[PDB]
Assembly symmetry: C3
């Protein structure tokens, strides 16, 4: 049949993607690892989840408005090709500045201070993404993949070359 | 009928979205508030506009090439679910560095200095987004929302696990 | 016929976009110029390539997971309107911090040090994008462009106003 997406859990640490509502457009993706990201630090957070997006579609592995509005964790949107059967990685950076100051509080993905019994010194603006937290979503859209034809001029001429804030 | 989108203006400060051309793919969104963003400062700029995206679609509340190329104002693309009837917020950050230096000129969304009769000291790289300025656009695309089926291996095996700059 | 996209090479420095696989969702875009980007520096890298996206579609000129995961080069996704026949520009920023330190090594788009016989002093975190390197991709998706109808309340009431990390 159609209207079905294959998903493969690559470890015990993985979790099956879930739609929040029937109305909602994507599936929440869970982190399969606990990671501390210092200011300006980049990482590819593993999900231990693979999918088989069929042809004529592309998967947008993208941020959640809750995480992106509350924290300086920035997720560059991954375009999951209709073929990539590997481990989905979340391309992330802590875009907080490295101002050289210290603190004893990490911050969670809701920007709340993490209280812990054992005291540790962290760089200010550091985040902990915990195993099993919702940090991304996958929205699947159809694509158009025609063959390209080189030309010296186009088929028809109103917008033209105007762009980059021309109105 | 179909081919119609409901829009609700939540205040006098709101404005109806507009297509720039017939050719263009999205609707320009207007700020309903005047906001100053210092370097590294994050905000959710209200539009006082709500919409009812019908099911099988998602709305991409996204940047304009003019604003994003000229300024360090970065808009994280919001995915407006086919259901969210609330106030559309523009998830924004001033990604200019906080170098500790001062100036008397704010900068507008075209990166032009704002001249004002009364002198004030601002942090360098600060922006003023004025009420009624075009700061974002909404592009609506169809989505594919199938039911997920867990598997141990996929239906067919060429790309495979290769990614993250493998070619 | 349909299922064809017109492309126009605006100079000798341009190159025709290419699909990596048959499975893949987009066309790799090549830089038509050699550019050095210092920390925090913004640019619009020219491709010397134009396209005619037909109506009912939009082109996402977007990052590659290889470049974005390995370097601090951030590409803001351009929405190419179904009409824009101009030179496609890659809206890019070097999001590496300006920590005031120096080095003799530029970095390429794989984050590898560039060894050169003549010694030069660069700012730390500077990148060289060379003419003919793959720095972006174009994914084309269909759009929905209805006429807007203003209302005081919506046609039907479960999600409602809930958002920005409400679950
Ligand atoms: O965030 C991401 C982005 C991409 N990917 C995977 C999916 C995609 O099929 C694959 C390659 O994506 P891109 O074509 O955008 N990156 P690049 O062109 O550099 O790699 P390749 O040379 O393999 O195409 O990497 C992720 O798992 N997470
Ligand atoms: O920039 C934005 C992003 C999202 N939104 C709204 C639209 C969407 O329906 C809602 C939730 O979007 P996400 O699912 O991407 N964020 P999150 O998953 O954190 O919130 P929720 O738990 O409500 O799904 O927030 C905005 O108004 N502006
Ligand atoms: O990265 C980009 C982004 C946009 N563009 C072009 C394509 C698009 O048709 C045109 C305008 O895009 P936007 O509507 O998103 N920018 P803006 O609304 O500021 O400019 P205009 O006033 O011309 O619509 O600029 C690029 O070439 N590269
Ligand atoms: Mg959600
Ligand atoms: Mg526009
Ligand atoms: Mg920054
Ligand atoms: Mg590719």
């Amino acid at each position: 049949m159609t209207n079905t997406l294959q998903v493969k859990l690559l470890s015990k640490n993985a979790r099956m993607p879930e739609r929040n509502h029937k109305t909602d457009a994507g599936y929440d993706i869970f982190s399969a690892e606990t990671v501390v990201l210092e200011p300006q630090e980049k990482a590819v957070i593993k999900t231990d989840v693979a999918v088989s997006i069929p042809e004529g579609y592309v998967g947008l592995l993208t941020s959640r408005s809750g995480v992106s509005s509350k924290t300086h964790l920035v997720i560059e949107t991954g375009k999951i090709d209709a073929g990539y059967h590997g481990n989905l990685g979340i391309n992330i950076k802590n875009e907080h500045e490295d101002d050289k100051m210290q603190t004893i509080f990490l911050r969670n993905i809701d920007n709340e201070k993490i209280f812990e019994k054992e005291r540790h010194l962290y760089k200010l603006g550091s985040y902990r993404i915990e195993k099993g937290e919702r940090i991304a979503q996958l929205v699947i859209v159809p694509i158009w993949t025609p063959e390209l034809k080189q030309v010296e001029e186009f088929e028809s001429v109103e917008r033209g070359e105007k762009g980059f804030g021309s109105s």
